[PDB]
Ligand binder design. Structure first.
Ligand SMILES: NC(=O)c1ccc[n+]([C@@H]2O[C@H](COP(=O)([O-])OP(=O)(O)OC[C@H]3O[C@@H](n4cnc5c(N)ncnc54)[C@H](O)[C@@H]3O)[C@@H](O)[C@H]2O)c1
Ligand SMILES: NC(=O)c1ccc[n+]([C@@H]2O[C@H](COP(=O)([O-])OP(=O)(O)OC[C@H]3O[C@@H](n4cnc5c(N)ncnc54)[C@H](O)[C@@H]3O)[C@@H](O)[C@H]2O)c1
Ligand SMILES: NC(=O)c1ccc[n+]([C@@H]2O[C@H](COP(=O)([O-])OP(=O)(O)OC[C@H]3O[C@@H](n4cnc5c(N)ncnc54)[C@H](O)[C@@H]3O)[C@@H](O)[C@H]2O)c1
Ligand SMILES: NC(=O)c1ccc[n+]([C@@H]2O[C@H](COP(=O)([O-])OP(=O)(O)OC[C@H]3O[C@@H](n4cnc5c(N)ncnc54)[C@H](O)[C@@H]3O)[C@@H](O)[C@H]2O)c1
Ligand SMILES: O=c1[nH]cnc2c1ncn2[C@@H]1O[C@H](COP(=O)(O)O)[C@@H](O)[C@H]1O
Ligand SMILES: O=c1[nH]cnc2c1ncn2[C@@H]1O[C@H](COP(=O)(O)O)[C@@H](O)[C@H]1O
Ligand SMILES: O=c1[nH]cnc2c1ncn2[C@@H]1O[C@H](COP(=O)(O)O)[C@@H](O)[C@H]1O
Ligand SMILES: O=c1[nH]cnc2c1ncn2[C@@H]1O[C@H](COP(=O)(O)O)[C@@H](O)[C@H]1O
Lengths: 375, 375, 375, 375
């Protein structure tokens, strides 16, 4: 019959909205708040959405959530909690090598939990690009680390490329994550060096002043899309880092091509985060600082020291983030994050820009007073 | 003579401004505050403007105003007042089925008043898409409801399409309104299911945080235009829902293709609205909350609970909205809302964008102090 | 009901094709063969199409056809035949003033026939812009001429403007046609001088070499549209002159805003045209030359002398042109030429460009041999 | 009064057509036949147009016409005739140095005639860029040459720049013309070398096959405009060379920014041109060949050898070219070539493109047979 012979199973489907390709080809510098994802078709419940994601070329997680390698975010307690919730944590390196190795050992000696072949909790750690980081690399490797991230603001350098090749020659079994990068040109040199994943973001962090101090960086949404589009051609996953304020930001970063999301301030002031609580203005809060702030390190500061208010425990906050990601996937019409990215690259997923008035209308407005309770 | 033979009765009419088609084809996400309607020609007084409008394919109202189905906006008293003023009200469903049926019966047992063939006040009600909403549908039908709205944030789903077909097979006399939708693709599935009208808006409500929590939605002006343009091809009217803050917003929604306008916060803190008044900061106010807030309903909140200040009675506020709609129609040069939409689709009505500086100049500015009294 | 209240009587009407405004705003130089008129809706027979048209501000004709003022096209016999068929003829001026006055007197003393208040056939004549043309103007005025055309290749000059004001001061009853012009800038000076119509075309004539000799002119379709759009603002009709090869060209010139069409070679080699027939190559033909050729007049030639083959009598050829114009109007969906121009300016009439391959496909192609017979 | 105070003496002047800047910024490669010049306003007779033009920074001619330095175009007889008519001729160099010096001396020993301070006829000559051209330069300088052209297909070279500096150091009184160039980048190096004029054109000659053989060159109209726009910034005049087939081409080259026009085939087969006449096909003709053809000079030919038909004497042909240039200036509305270029750069002069159908309509068409006589 003609109902099938004209075009097999493909209904008319009216054209409305922009594809990611034409949204990010306007040359404008877009942030997460500058656009939205148009709704699709629903034929499943939100509990049937799969959040399985690739951290690297051969490391798979149950959820796309990762903890940032900072001295006010990730130590053994945070790493254990993130591994148990189905994600992972990267331990910071501004301590001594012996201390970081002991923290990794505490994580390895401990339903959706991320584990290895030996049934131990997965753990990651950060290192620098100086010659003394090779002794630190050896201690982290003997402690049983599974994945390592080369931590830098600008990762397209001779020092990082030399470090990547040294690790690949000495430890062929270790997964190496390069970064930070914000352009396809920077991503090419690191993929050719032999990295297993990429870290994306420059100046987008809540405690980062790099864009005002050094005049270098890029808006986070366009950087994630551009780097992910290039890295997809070689099977290399992208970690979206910096600028996440709510679960809607996480859903946007994943829909633009990222495979996992790394967060700082969102996980700051939680029970498992390093440092103790203190009171001010009648409310509880905890310290949060940038690794490039003068406190954390002739010297030019690229970060600030501050505080965020109490958030509870990650064993109660991560399941809320999971439920929000699944509800966002159900609204757009995809049964998994893999399907979301597949329909994004095929042009089936649609987007729309927002003006300043559109953002004002989208947020809470025109009320005398209100309470904003998330869960 | 040549004054008529060159072009019959069509004067030169200088070309200035943009048509709705070219305003909403720029791909930008426009809100009501982002544009204006250019003035036309006046040959009648504002008292001669007709506001007759279609709620559905076969339900007509004297005015285009509707009350939102919320537990802080519409119960029997609000529905009676809106029906008497020439509009209609949709009773909320977060109560028990027996209670909602009794509230509809109060409205049915009570110059521009919206009435049926039996001369009783018109009344509407909302239902969900779960299998137990069928017993609620039966009680609402026996109570004498005239029109029913399937209440959901994203209405392009298997559950809503199944519910629409069940209602059409069982109650061929009942009018069914689908929604919420913001794209022509979503509107097509519901029009093919057999709906009688569409509800448009997603994340534009004053108490809505859906765009920030789930990253899904669309700016209200472009969504209303795009859905109305598609729904006009099948004789299906559009109800504009969310983001109405003043009578200028109502006039813009009607001029972009909507046939009726739904409002929750504009009618909140009125005498007929549910809940009692209370004092704070030396002024009177009433509670107003989103149906997706934690108070109104593992759980992800999509709304907030708050309060708005006193507004008086709708028997004095609705005639003010009517007078403002008529004055706006006289300024643009149309004798009825039907004529406004006809000249909008023909390209005769013209529009212009506003920059941020244009919005600042358009509002009250450069005064030490002032009093803004509407009526 | 909603079928009328959404938009009164205006059906959806799918958008396809370009309006004249957007076709002639591309900046490209378009000729009649570069575009087509898209078909419309038919609710009448071709015999019900009215071809009434304005020659000037107060002279109306039954058909839009006019004879060019050339010594191989228009004398008393051609003027009588065009007047009897419902059009008009302009007598050439390269003869002596006494001869042209006698030729006008023959026309004045001779169903759709174009006549004056005294029931005599309407007649027109051409003059130059030199001081001796004032004595010629007086003889033509005493002979009873009704309309006069100032014949020049470039009519935006001090000499033509002085002549127009002299005629208006001396003969307030005489109609004056200015030209030739191809731009709105040239048209403004002549409309402000006080002309009653405009003549449009420069270098588009079949016997014209002005574009190759003087590098000045414009493609005929864009020139007619641009001049007619400006002249419409003052109630001044436009005569389309030069480049007409078939009835499809006549229909295009009228649809682009012209009120009448002037033709040379199309009416050449007819029985009523001046000069006798002669044989060559076994077929009959008649001489046709440009007024700027060396034969018709230190000296720079802007025209050529040649010949075209026999065409029969105009009493048999004009009714064929009338039937073709009416069939073209029926195909596009208009009951009169006035309606055609009214729907062209309103944007309801639609157009499409043609590539070189499109013109090859549109003409007769892929045959070994054929006979092309018009009527 | 308001008629002067609103905008002093500046009338409305409707905007229609393109400026040269926006015509040549489309990126398309345009030839003289691809566009036209729109008509302006006439307040003078064609006999009042001044054709005075600058050949170099300090050599002025009565007419803008120059003879090309070819062995079938310019020798003493042609140079004397062009000097007497108000232009100049450049003697070819494919002969011996002694012969070229004797031809220059014949010209120097002989109303609008181009002369020097000593009242002798102006004369020019061509040379190459090899070391042997320095002895030739000395002989030409002693013979009394006034201006010299460095003859090459591509003049942006180290050999030509060295030759220009040698001539400026040795003969500060001699005028030096560089070329050929078609881009502003090439023009900059020669203007910085110290040239007094530029020669523009590459592959546009009637006998030139450089574009098909070497794949290098540029369309002549865009090359003349682009080189003239840049050379105007330093007071350096441009000579337009190649592609001139009629007086309309001459008017276009002058209106696009050139100060003088150099022609080959247009002056070929004239009485004063070198070589004797011969008969073929029943008509008289003379040989014309490119300097890069195998006959005129391991070897790659860039020119062809052929013949063109008889043209009469230049003493009757140059006055025809002068009359045509003056008529073209009167049609566009300028009293001199200086005014034409001034209104071209100010945006007051307007242009329009031509499609292939527009060129077909602009030329002679739809005739059985005709004769095209120019004067
Ligand atoms: N946008 C961001 O992500 C961002 C920006 C700024 C800072 N930071 C944070 O601040 C910390 C510091 O960042 P960073 O980029 O300065 O780290 P880094 O180690 O790259 O900085 C040290 C500097 O020394 C140079 N250097 C590196 N290796 C070297 C070697 N082997 N020999 C000689 N010179 C060498 C580098 O050019 C670098 O600028 C990081 O831990 C990072 O988390 C982040
Ligand atoms: N933009 C908006 O208009 C908006 C957005 C969010 C919330 N709200 C308000 O909040 C309230 C809740 O909105 P909602 O969209 O969550 O309502 P809903 O009933 O659609 O939500 C329940 C969820 O369960 C699923 N579901 C629905 N029917 C089902 C069935 N038969 N079987 C299995 N699963 C089913 C749906 O996917 C839906 O997300 C509404 O009353 C609405 O007024 C409005
Ligand atoms: N595209 C065309 O329509 C076109 C082009 C060229 C020629 N022609 C035909 O050739 C004929 C000649 O055309 P034309 O434009 O040369 O006519 P014309 O009378 O304008 O030409 C005479 C020239 O003398 C000048 N002149 C005019 N009046 C003058 C006065 N009072 N004092 C001093 N100088 C004056 C004008 O500048 C004009 O160029 C026309 O009859 C026309 O039909 C037509
Ligand atoms: N578009 C044009 O105008 C064009 C194109 C091709 C040929 N022509 C004609 O053909 C003739 C030959 O043109 P041409 O450009 O080949 O002349 P030319 O003298 O530049 O050619 C000789 C070649 O030798 C090289 N050369 C030049 N001077 C040199 C030096 N001192 N030492 C070493 N090498 C040197 C150059 O690269 C050049 O390609 C010209 O007279 C010209 O009129 C014209
Ligand atoms: O000092 C700093 N300046 C700028 N960026 C930093 C600095 N320290 C850490 N970062 C980045 O900030 C991210 C955390 O950003 P957040 O989630 O917005 O709070 C980290 O993962 C790093 O990429
Ligand atoms: O909890 C919620 N979140 C988001 N939108 C909601 C929620 N509850 C109701 N809505 C919408 O908000 C509209 C009222 O918008 P308002 O008049 O601008 O305040 C209602 O008609 C619903 O479409
Ligand atoms: O010598 C001439 N050169 C250029 N155009 C001319 C000349 N003589 C007449 N014309 C124009 O040619 C038109 C006729 O063009 P045709 O209908 O294509 O044959 C006349 O009405 C004049 O506008
Ligand atoms: O052999 C050749 N090939 C290409 N161009 C040449 C050659 N010889 C001369 N030319 C150019 O041709 C111009 C003359 O072109 P014409 O006026 O179209 O015939 C000369 O002034 C040179 O710039």
């Amino acid at each position: 019959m003609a109902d099938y012979l004209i075009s097999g199973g493909t209904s008319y489907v009216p054209d409305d909205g922009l594809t990611a390709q034409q949204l990010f080809n306007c040359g404008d510098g877009l942030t997460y708040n500058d656009f939205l994802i148009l709704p699709g078709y629903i034929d499943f419940t939100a509990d049937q959405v799969d959040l399985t994601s690739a951290l690297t070329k051969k490391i798979t997680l149950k959820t796309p959530l990762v903890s940032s390698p900072m001295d006010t975010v990730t130590e053994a307690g945070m790493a254990i909690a993130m591994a148990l919730t189905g994600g992972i944590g990267f331990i910071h390196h501004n301590c001594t090598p012996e201390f970081q190795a002991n923290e990794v050992r505490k994580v390895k000696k401990y339903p959706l939990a991320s584990k290895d072949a030996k049934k131990q909790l997965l753990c990651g750690a950060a290192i620098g690009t100086h010659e003394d980081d090779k002794y630190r690399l050896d201690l982290l490797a003997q402690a049983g680390v599974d994945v390592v991230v080369l931590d830098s603001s600008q990762g397209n350098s001779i020092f990082q490329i030399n470090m990547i090749k040294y690790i690949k020659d000495k430890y062929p079994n270790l997964q190496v994550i390069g970064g930070n990068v914000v352009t396809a040109a920077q991503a090419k040199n690191l993929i050719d060096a032999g990295v297993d994943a990429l870290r994306v973001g420059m100046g987008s962090g809540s405690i980062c002043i790099t864009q005002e101090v050094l005049a270098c960086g890029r808006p986070q949404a366009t950087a994630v899309y551009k780097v992910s589009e290039y890295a997809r051609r070689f099977g290399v996953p992208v970690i979206a880092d910096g600028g996440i304020q709510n679960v809607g930001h996480i859903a946007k970063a994943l829909a633009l091509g990222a495979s996992t999301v790394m967060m700082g301030s969102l996980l700051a002031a939680t029970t498992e985060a390093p440092g103790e609580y203190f009171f001010s203005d009648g409310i509880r809060l905890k310290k949060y600082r940038g690794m490039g702030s003068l406190d954390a390190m002739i010297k030019v500061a690229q970060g600030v020291s501050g505080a965020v208010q109490d958030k509870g425990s990650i064993h109660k906050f991560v399941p809320y983030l999971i439920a929000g990601i699944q509800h966002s996937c159900q609204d757009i019409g995809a049964k998994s994050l893999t399907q979301v990215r597949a329909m994004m690259y095929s042009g089936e997923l649609k987007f729309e820009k927002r003006t300043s008035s559109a953002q004002v209308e989208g947020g809470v407005h025109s009320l005398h007073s209100y309470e904003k309770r998330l869960f």
